């Protein structure tokens, strides 16, 4: 299984006596076991792309051939760990060496083999039964949150010949044995899957269930759905932290994966430092987010193969849990950083460049990336379902949208949560641009909204109409000063402000506003829009002659109603239950209608 | 037929990108298909794009990941990719490789046709002289569609070009006052887009006359440059051997161009613009020109090669080279979409190169050509007036300019705006044209002769 190094021209190593090798196989070059891949082959010689520095590699050094191509190791212990872009545990490398550096040629198994995991068989299987790919034959108890379900690896099937009894097993033992056509396969708790291969599913389903984030903006106006794909701009002043924390802390997904592609060292530290300190209430207990999270960390000075592969390593980990029936939410910190890594590799391979210097296949790679997300029907007899969402960020050089990476991304993702810096400078958070942002899942979610809430859809339609009109009136206001202006337009302007202030704006550093349940979000909007309609009618039905209602009359007459509307965001769901908050909102609705009634 | 046993080789010389190079091959044939098995049993196929002596270069469709050098087993079929075709392919769903994906059987061939096809003898090609009624005023009036014409929709990411194509599939008839077999090549698209069309075809109750070819974003990029040929090859069988009128729709042709560009880079071919092969035009003509009627046979093929314009750049090689080959374009844009106008079809940069013969006395109404030309003049001028007024202000305009702003405003909401299920006749479209033209006095309708104005304008 060994060959020899024939020569080194830099990061490219030529091997000889390596006839039995496949393209995009893996090799460990030299006595330090440098990680690389075989790209070009000719005769019994192979051209190896080495990820790490090749200094010191000699002619005649050994090359160890590894049968599996670039793959992700999947099994118990994946949760709570931080990995390199090519699946190297950074928390073990720094702890098994006492070093601060990643050793050159470091060879630490992705999942430690010194942990005795608590494994319980399904208790439904027997020796002699039939099992197929995707079937679950036992569960490992990792922590209080996520059960780590052990599936039969895809592309395997047969008759069960041995089932391990319940007990403590490590990742190097044998848990299940199966025989197919006389061939016996011994399986442990860990499966290996090529990172560039898409894990099969029974069927790909439409995404209909909302992604229940905790923000009023980026939900009511711009919905995301479980299994959907969105993009978020990543600029210093955009306030992207709000989405990252809100999505990772309170989301209705089961597993969070955060993927770095190749960011600044200090930025990777900020993510690695923040995440372990995040908590959420679960069963009344406060649990660390890292018990249901996995993170892949890549800085700009990591091997380019890892920075390019990081994005696919993340989604492979995501699909692994998708196949368990979990809802997984993956964030790519910067897909622009990935695209940069990809261009570098194309350059190293002396490929002809295309648009703005990027590889000709940039679009094909992004399209196949996002296509892997979605709600699916899982493999295996348990007839379980799950999904993967992608909320990858884009950060093109210069902030322009002409860069092929951002342009291609926007043509692929169905939701764009366009953020702005001006809003952050104004201290308005979340920093959502509103006019640029869009969601193309509004139709897909109409069935859910109609079934469970009914009035939500006309409310979000009116809300966008009010906000857009507020923008449309901007030129009239600038040239007029609200003097030569219709009273109906004054309602639009002042109510639109009310919406911007006491609905779309949310203060995540307050205990009452940490998370806004949907029923509260629609409650708040319903009363504001109901006010809008009542104010429009109060003016319009009396605007003929003699005795008319104006905004000055409405504002002065029922100022307590405008105050009560602004106060609605303070209804803390932790102390005031669903019935109490709805009851108080119902009282405002009645008081509001009566306030206008007193004017007619 | 080919009675001699095929040879199997384990003589792979080397692998370089998507190309597997074999040596020691007996009498290599150019553009023959090779079937290869990987050490793990995976089966893949490719085509010989070059032969030299005992060597041959095979481009593998599925890809070259996992291809070995010692255990790889290849066999040469001994012919070119000739594909099975039958009439009963309508109602079936295939992948981009020509295999069924609807849980039905493989194709029970009536014959085998060369995917490369043959050029139609221009002496027997018969000029199109029949109009298709699309029901869309923006098309039937100012850019008519002939039966056998090639009209892509130039669009941009996020615009409803899929809805327009779907609409055309249901309400496309004739103006002779008819069931088209539709072949839909879904390449480089996501599941939801392919499911959108498949569901619409069933909703329309026409699925028994629809043949689908799917090659999704997660499918190999090399198969994406045979899918159009598979669709058109089937269309040729139906149209020219079974005298069935066929409508062939190719989804974002830009995924074809990108798949082609990748192959061009891999083979180090001479680039033209934006990295695309210098022969991109010739390759596109091979796909596009498989259309039109043939004298003496009652079939036809009509194409709608919809394509996405990268960054809305109308001069990008993809729309540019297409514009040179096809008989014009419908072209949608964002300026109409951003105002909730559907269909968002912008007539100004559009044209139909067969319109001059498919309209008028004996075809639709004798004033058709005159109404279209004047509407183009009035629409373009209204746009010119906005370009001026944006700087000089409304007070700088005279009555001669305000008329074009009134026309432009009424034109877009009355003529272009319709809705996904608004099916207008060609005669209703012209009547609407006149309603807009009657905004102006006769003297300003300078593209229309008095021999037409005197009859139609008074009404």
């Amino acid at each position: 299984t060994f060959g020899y190094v024939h020569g080194v021209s830099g990061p490219v190593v030529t091997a000889c006596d390596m006839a039995g090798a496949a393209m995009y196989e893996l090799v460990r070059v030299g006595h330090s076991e440098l990680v690389g891949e075989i790209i070009r082959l000719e005769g019994d010689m192979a051209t190896i792309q080495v990820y790490e520095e090749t200094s010191g590699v000699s002619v005649g050094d050994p090359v160890l051939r590894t049968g599996k191509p670039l793959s992700v190791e999947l099994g118990p212990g994946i949760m709570g760990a931080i990995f390199d872009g090519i699946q190297r545990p950074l928390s073990d490398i720094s702890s098994q060496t006492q070093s601060i550096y990643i050793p050159r040629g470091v060879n630490v198994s992705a999942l430690s083999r010194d942990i005795k995991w608590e494994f319980i068989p399904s208790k439904n299987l027997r020796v002699g039964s039939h099992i197929t790919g995707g079937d679950i034959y036992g569960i490992v108890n990792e922590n209080s949150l996520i059960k780590h379900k052990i599936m039969l690896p895809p592309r395997s099937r047969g008759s069960v010949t041995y089932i391990a009894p319940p007990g403590n097993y490590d990742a190097s033992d044998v848990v299940l044995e199966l025989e197919f056509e006389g061939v016996k396969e011994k399986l442990s708790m860990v499966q290996v899957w090529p990172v560039r291969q898409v894990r099969p599913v029974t069927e790909k389903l439409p995404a209909n269930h909302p992604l229940l984030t905790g923000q009023r903006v980026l939900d009511a106006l711009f919905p995301c759905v479980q299994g959907g794909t969105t993009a978020i701009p990543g600029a210093f002043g955009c306030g992207k932290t709000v989405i990252s924390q809100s999505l990772s802390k309170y989301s209705n997904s089961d597993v969070i994966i955060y993927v770095g592609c190749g960011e600044r060292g200090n930025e990777m530290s900020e993510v690695l430092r923040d995440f372990p300190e995040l908590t959420m209430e679960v069963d009344g207990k406060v649990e660390s987010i890292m018990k249901r999270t996995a993170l892949v960390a890549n800085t700009s000075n990591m091997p380019v193969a890892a920075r390019e592969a990081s994005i696919y390593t993340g989604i492979t980990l995501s699909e692994y849990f998708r196949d368990m029936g979990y809802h997984v939410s993956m964030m790519a910190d910067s897909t622009s950083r990935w695209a940069e890594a990809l261009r570098e590799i194309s350059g190293r391979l002396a490929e002809m460049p295309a648009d703005s210097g990027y590889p000709a296949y940039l679009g094909a790679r992004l399209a196949s990336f996002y296509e892997r997300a979605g709600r699916v029907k899982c493999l295996g007899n348990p007839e379980r379902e799950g999904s993967v969402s992608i909320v990858g960020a884009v950060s093109p050089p210069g902030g322009d949208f002409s860069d092929p990476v951002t342009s291609a991304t926007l043509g692929i993702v169905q939701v764009f949560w366009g953020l702005d810096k001006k809003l952050a400078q104004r201290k308005h958070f979340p920093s959502v641009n509103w006019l640029i942002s869009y969601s193309k899942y509004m139709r897909a979610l109409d069935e859910y909204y109609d079934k469970h809430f009914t009035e939500f859809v006309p409310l979000r339609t009116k809300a966008k109409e009010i906000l857009q009109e507020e923008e449309d009136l901007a030129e009239i206001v600038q040239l007029v000063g609200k003097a030569s202006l219709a009273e109906t337009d004054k309602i639009t302007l002042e109510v639109a402000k009310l919406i911007k202030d006491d609905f779309l704006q949310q203060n995540g550093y307050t205990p009452y506003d940490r998370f806004c349940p949907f029923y509260k979000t629609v409650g708040m909007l319903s009363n504001m829009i109901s006010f809008y309609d009542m104010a429009r009618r109060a003016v319009e039905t009396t605007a003929q002659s003699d005795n008319k209602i104006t905004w000055s009359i409405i504002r002065e007459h029922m100022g307590e109603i405008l105050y009560k509307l602004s106060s609605m965001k303070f209804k803390d769901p932790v102390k005031d239950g669903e019935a109490k908050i709805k009851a108080d909102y119902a009282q405002l609705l009645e008081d509001m209608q009566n306030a206008f009634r007193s004017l007619e | 037929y080919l009675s001699q046993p095929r040879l199997t080789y384990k003589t792979v010389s080397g692998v370089n990108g998507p190309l597997v190079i074999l040596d020691h091959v007996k009498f290599p044939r150019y553009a023959e298909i090779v079937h290869l098995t990987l050490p793990d049993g995976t089966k893949r196929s490719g085509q010989v794009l070059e032969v030299s002596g005992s060597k041959a270069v095979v481009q593998v469709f599925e890809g070259t990941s996992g291809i070995d050098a010692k255990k790889t087993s290849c066999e040469f079929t001994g012919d070119i990719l000739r594909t099975p075709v039958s009439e009963d392919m309508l109602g079936r769903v295939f992948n981009g490789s020509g295999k069924p994906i609807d849980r039905g059987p493989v194709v029970l061939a009536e014959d085998f046709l060369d995917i490369m096809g043959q050029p139609i003898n221009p002496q027997c090609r018969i000029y199109p002289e029949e109009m298709i009624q699309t029901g869309i005023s923006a098309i039937d009036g100012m850019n008519s569609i002939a039966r056998g014409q090639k009209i892509p929709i130039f669009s941009a990411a996020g615009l409803p070009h899929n809805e327009i194509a779907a609409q055309i599939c249901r309400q496309a008839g004739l103006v002779k006052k008819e069931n088209f077999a539709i072949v839909f090549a879904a390449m480089g698209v996501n599941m939801e887009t392919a499911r959108f069309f498949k569901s619409d075809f069933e909703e329309n109750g026409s699925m028994d006359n629809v043949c689908l070819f799917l090659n999704l974003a997660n499918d190999p990029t090399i198969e994406r440059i045979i899918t159009p040929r598979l669709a058109l090859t089937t269309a040729e069988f139906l149209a020219y051997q079974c005298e069935k009128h066929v409508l062939v729709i190719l989804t974002d042709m830009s995924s074809y161009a990108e798949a082609l560009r990748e192959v061009s880079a891999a083979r180090e071919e001479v680039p033209g613009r934006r990295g695309f092969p210098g022969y991109m035009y010739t390759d596109l003509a091979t796909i596009y020109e498989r259309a039109g009627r043939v004298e003496g046979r009652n079939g036809s093929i009509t194409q709608i090669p919809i394509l996405t314009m990268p960054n809305d750049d109308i001069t990008h090689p993809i729309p540019d080279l297409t514009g040179y080959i096809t008989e014009g374009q419908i072209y949608v844009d964002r300026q109409l979409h951003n105002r909730q106008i559907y269909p968002p079809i912008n007539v100004l940069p559009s044209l139909s190169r067969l319109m001059k013969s498919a309209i008028g006395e004996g075809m639709t109404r004798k004033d058709h050509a005159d109404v279209s030309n004047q509407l183009y003049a009035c629409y373009a001028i209204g746009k010119d007036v906005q370009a001026m007024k944006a700087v000089v202000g409304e007070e700088a305009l005279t009555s001669d300019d305000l008329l074009y702003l009134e026309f432009l405003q009424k034109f877009e909401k009355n003529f272009i705006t319709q809705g996904p299920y608004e099916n207008r006749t060609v005669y209703e479209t012209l009547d609407i044209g006149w309603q807009l033209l009657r905004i102006f006095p006769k003297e300003m309708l300078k593209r229309i002769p008095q021999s037409t104005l005197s009859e139609f304008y008074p009404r």
């Binding site: 002809m352 460049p353 | 001479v270 680039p271």
Partner: peptide, 19 residues
């Protein structure tokens, strides 16, 4: 870039022939 790539490949081909 295209021309330089072909120049580098032609140089490699010339070198192999000389060996």
């Amino acid at each position: 870039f295209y021309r330089l790539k072909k120049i580098q490949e032609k140089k490699k081909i010339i070198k192999e022939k000389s060996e």
